[PDB]
């Protein structure tokens, strides 16, 4: 039955077949995105209709299309020609990755720039970098990538150690033309290698680590049915996968006694952006929307046992479409396991004589992706006590530049002559809430300090206040760590045994939000990133905080447009969008490969249950 | 040699003998605190002098003494009589715990109050609660405890479910007199039990948890020598234990190539306070300095294998003095183990074809203590990548009251008629820094946003600024989460290969600090808790942010007194004092036994190393 099951090879093949039969997938067409759509609200009672959404690119220069297909019924539901100058370009295609370097290698301007620096063109790697929207009128409606160069001394060399600063190129990847080559002057190309598997750099490998063995002799405590339905320690959910968003959780619910109680209808990382803070014209345009522009799911790693995921691991192997509509498996792309999480609850009582200790555990659902130099792990955690948590783990190799003679206010030094421009990695978690069902509301809760005086003669009292966000125009909120600000999602029509509305409290890390000037291109294209919390009324076409087409798309779409509708969110079907990020001033310790750093958020039950939900956990 | 070794049973007995011989430990004397002193600065070339500090109480009413003994030389170094009305009372004595209930049980005022509520005196437990300093002039110079009552229906009942509100009593535990009994009127005593091992409340215990087995077939990767010297994955340290502070870390250093590089000379939790935010006179005086008043180390639990600490565990069993100077072992009081910590670093490179993944681990040193209703786990972590972290885990049973008819702005409802007053748990970590040696300084680092305009035409630039804290008067700092504020401890005389001062960066959680009105008794007694970061010049007698004697002691000592000296801290031997805490508005899920919640901080290397320190970690 499972309408939330993962896409199968057969379903993608059938989408291909339906598109072909309908005249929409001839030899010049390429699929830039393909994913299954979620069931409509209230569709459970009706029969399944598995629908897929497809963005089709045309290599001959014709306009791209957005298409929705019914794989159940073998039909095309809708097909619409896109005007990309207006609504945005399609996501970067796998196959364009090589094109920037290939075109530049026979361009006379590019070759002149390389010859000035005594660089062999065969050794020069060029990254295919998203272009954004700046002052170049000719780029409007054209698929552009920008190119930054890095020297690779030999095939196994880390080119990131050898950035070619002072040089950037712009390329039309459809007409296959180089539009601009900018050379602001030569900088020394940093000479030290950054080869972290070279014994010369690592030194002798440590022989001091003794093994750690994590086993489950009776297997894991979770079950998987229907391919992707998880049941674990009162929790129930479906693990989806999408080529854009990556791992998506559906139908997060908790079995409280005899009742399956919904909590979150859909949880995803709906966008992530990496804005750079270096004003050099060589990099001042760079803002990588890894999710919206590159599609993080499509570059999910195959994860190796005992290396990437340790313990008793159950894998999912999601299937995606290649550029022609053939199915492609990402073998062992999703890890699922439970792990011990220390003490859950403990008390040694002075009067009863009873000593009591219980252990915690969490269910982990993760994937790891690679976008150029960056590698990111996306981890969702469900805990015994009802807590839900997301954690992003950032690693890879830092994006480099030259380090200016005389230093920099916007770049860190990593090695002689080698710099790393300052940047942020900013995520948007889209939480389609369903606290005990769909009738929800959000309150902002602040700690309230009280003045010494009447009613508080010793000046010890403190309190809190809650402010209901009633309409979307009032629902764009900022952090206030000093006042312990959190946000509670509750169901005003579902009360606990103490007659208080059931709820969940979102605890943010209160890291800095987008630092760019509010008048910048990135502040408009990533408006979501300027505020910590947004609440919208649910709509099926409001999927991403940046809109459907982010690549080379100005403001116009996404959260600021959604919120303008000023819809009722006080006891309605709502969606929370939480912005959270890492602000990275690279350190020498990040070079030549960066140790993991983390950011995330959690939600904890807040009067959702009638007492602790973990009293039945055994010793 | 090991001058940082744990106190032995023999040393404690020998201190007893030296005190007895000196005429300082007759039959009326009791030891309220005993601990080993750290070696003086510059020791190492000179032979060992193990010195112990002792606070000696007199049950006959004589003035207490502070005494320092050289156990090496068999001498009393110093003995001084204390005027407690001036400098503070000694910590609460174990033997005083029973006294409050016992004295109240034959007091006619107390009995009248219990009779008004139809409570059998034999069933009424009375907590021995620290008194603080308020308006009661007769308490000055007297050892007072206050008593709040909880009914126990039978021996194994959790009395916390049955608070007796409207009633409090004050008792002189030396003269054995009840000074005051206050009855502001009857409240219903909540009737539901809170017995978390009663099958009627737990229901059938889960049978769904399959085992998780964590083993190390070759044993652990760390060594223990000299009883408490740890070496693990380049780290070196000594694990101390004190009855006041609990686990204390000494000589944290990292072996970088051939050189042992100090980072932190001493790390401890030097105070922790639990202020309550209920303005009822029954509780408005309550502020529990678990460390300074009660001594958290003395109540450290014996930790059961597979239950409290999971995996291949190495235990220390610290020895403390009882009230008479006899040694007492806390068996398995400190857990030591290493554990896997997910991915350390990972990159799959598009150009080199090299795929690389390494796992992280951390060394864990912990203890768990119980202070009445509260139980707290203190965890120190050292990570492969040079990160140092502390985590506190708070659990136990919440402190209860009646829940007022018509609600409360300062108390949460947990069960019918049962409340939990709002409170905070606020810690002070004292980090005697030694970044590459003792010549250190602290900078406050904020993110700096930049305006769009000349030099920043696209409005993307961002930067940071660092402000050196030059003197103690400038070194009392507050959080600013919005600007990503951190604090860097560096050595201005030790530079990395890039000619930059080596450093470590402190990352705080930026939780609310002390909420009480600044004119309250607790704001003065816990002044440290009002600001996130303090920096002092090291002095051997500046051990606690609240001074040596916290019990019933007004302001006048501790950090505000130390900072007044306005000493140079710019390239000097300095101490960082970081305040961090949890603000707890109890939830129904916290009842009848609370799931663990956490707070802490970490320090990460910041140009301390010349490149990543984990390049030599094997696959
Ligand atoms: Cu980064
Ligand atoms: Cu608490
Ligand atoms: Na919703
Ligand atoms: Na120091």
UniProtKB/Swiss-Prot annotation, chains A, B:
It comes from the Bacteria. Binds 1 copper ion per subunit. GO terms for molecular function: copper ion binding; primary methylamine oxidase activity; quinone binding. Its EC number is 1.4.3.21. Cu cation binds at residues 423, 425, 584. Changing residue 374 to F: Loss of activity. It catalyses: a primary methyl amine + O2 + H2O = an aldehyde + H2O2 + NH4(+); 2-phenylethylamine + O2 + H2O = 2-phenylacetaldehyde + H2O2 + NH4(+). Topaquinone (TPQ) is generated by copper-dependent autoxidation of a specific tyrosyl residue. Keywords: Copper, Disulfide bond, Metal-binding, Oxidoreductase, TPQ. Substrate binds at residues 288-299, 371-376. Its cofactor is Cu cation; L-topaquinone. One of its GO terms (biological process) is amine metabolic process. The modification 2',4',5'-topaquinone is found at residue 374. Belongs to the copper/topaquinone oxidase family. PANTHER family: COPPER AMINE OXIDASE, COPPER AMINE OXIDASE 1-RELATED. This is Phenylethylamine oxidase. It comes from Arthrobacter globiformis.
């Amino acid at each position: 039955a499972s309408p939330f099951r993962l896409a199968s090879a057969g379903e993608i093949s059938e989408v291909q077949g339906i598109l072909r039969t309908a005249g929409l997938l001839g030899p010049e067409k390429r699929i830039a995105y393909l994913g299954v759509l979620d069931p409509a609200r209230g569709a459970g009672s009706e029969a399944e209709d598995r629908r897929f959404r497809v963005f089709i690119h045309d290599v001959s220069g014709a306009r791209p299309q957005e298409v929705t297909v019914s794989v159940t019924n073998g039909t095309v539901i809708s097909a619409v020609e896109l005007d990309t100058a207006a609504t945005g370009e399609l996501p970067v295609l796998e196959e364009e990755f090589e094109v920037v370097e290939q075109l530049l290698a026979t361009d006379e301007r590019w070759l002149k720039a390389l010859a000035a620096r005594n660089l062999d063109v065969s050794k020069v790697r060029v990254a295919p970098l998203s272009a954004g929207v700046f002052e170049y009128a000719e780029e409007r409606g054209r698929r552009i990538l920008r190119g930054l160069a890095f020297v690779q001394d030999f095939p196994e060399d880390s080119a990131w150690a050898h950035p070619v600063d002072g040089l950037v190129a712009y390329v039309d990847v459809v007409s296959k033309e180089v539009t601009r080559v900018i050379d602001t002057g030569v900088f020394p190309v940093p000479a030290e290698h950054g080869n972290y598997t070279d014994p010369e750099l690592t030194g002798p490998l440590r022989t001091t680590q003794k093994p750690i063995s994590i086993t489950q002799p009776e297997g894991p405590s979770f079950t998987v049915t229907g391919g992707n339905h998880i049941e674990w320690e009162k929790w129930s959910l479906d693990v989806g996968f999408d080529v854009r968003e990556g791992v998506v959780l559906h139908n997060i619910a908790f079995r409280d006694g005899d009742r399956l109680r919904p909590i979150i209808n859909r949880a995803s990382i709906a966008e992530m952006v990496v804005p750079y803070g270096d004003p050099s014209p060589i990099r001042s345009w760079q803002n990588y929307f890894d999710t919206g522009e590159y599609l993080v799911g499509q570059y999910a790693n195959s994860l190796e046992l005992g290396c990437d995921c340790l313990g008793d691991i159950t894998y999912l192997s999601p299937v995606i479409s290649d550029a022609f509509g053939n199915p492609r498996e990402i073998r062992n792309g999703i890890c699922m396991h439970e792990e011990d999480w220390g003490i859950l609850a403990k008390h040694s009582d002075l009067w009863s004589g009873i000593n009591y200790t219980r252990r915690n555990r969490r269910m982990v659902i993760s994937f790891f992706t690679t976008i150029g130099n960056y590698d990111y792990g996306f981890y969702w955690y469900l805990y015994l006590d009802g807590t839900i948590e997301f954690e992003a783990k950032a690693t890879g190799v830092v994006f480099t530049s030259a380090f200016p003679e005389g230093g920099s206010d916007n770049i860190s030094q990593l090695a002689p002559g080698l710099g790393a421009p300052f940047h942020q990695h900013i995520f948007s978690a889209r939480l389609d809430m369903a606290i005990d069902g769909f009738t929800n509301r959000v309150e902002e809760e602040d700690v309230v300090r009280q003045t010494m005086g009447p009613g508080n003669e010793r000046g010890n009292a403190f309190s809190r206040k809650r402010t209901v966000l009633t309409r979307e125009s009032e629902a764009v909120r900022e952090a206030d760590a000093r006042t312990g600000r959190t946000w509670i999602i509750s169901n005003p029509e579902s009360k606990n045994r103490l007659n208080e509305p059931v709820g969940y409290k979102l605890h943010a890390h209160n890291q800095p939000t987008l630092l760019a000037d509010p008048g910048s291109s990135i502040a408009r294209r990533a408006a979501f990133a300027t505020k910590d919390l947004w609440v919208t009324r649910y709509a099926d076409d409001e999927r991403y905080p940046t809109g459907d087409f982010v690549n080379q798309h100005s403001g116009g779409a996404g959260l600021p447009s959604y919120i303008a509708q000023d819809r009722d969110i006080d006891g309605q079907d709502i969606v929370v969008w939480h912005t959270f990020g890492l602000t990275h001033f690279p350190r020498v310790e990040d070079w030549p490969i960066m140790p993991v750093d983390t950011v995330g958020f959690k939600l904890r039950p807040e009067g959702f249950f009638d007492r602790s939900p973990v009293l039945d956990v055994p010793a």
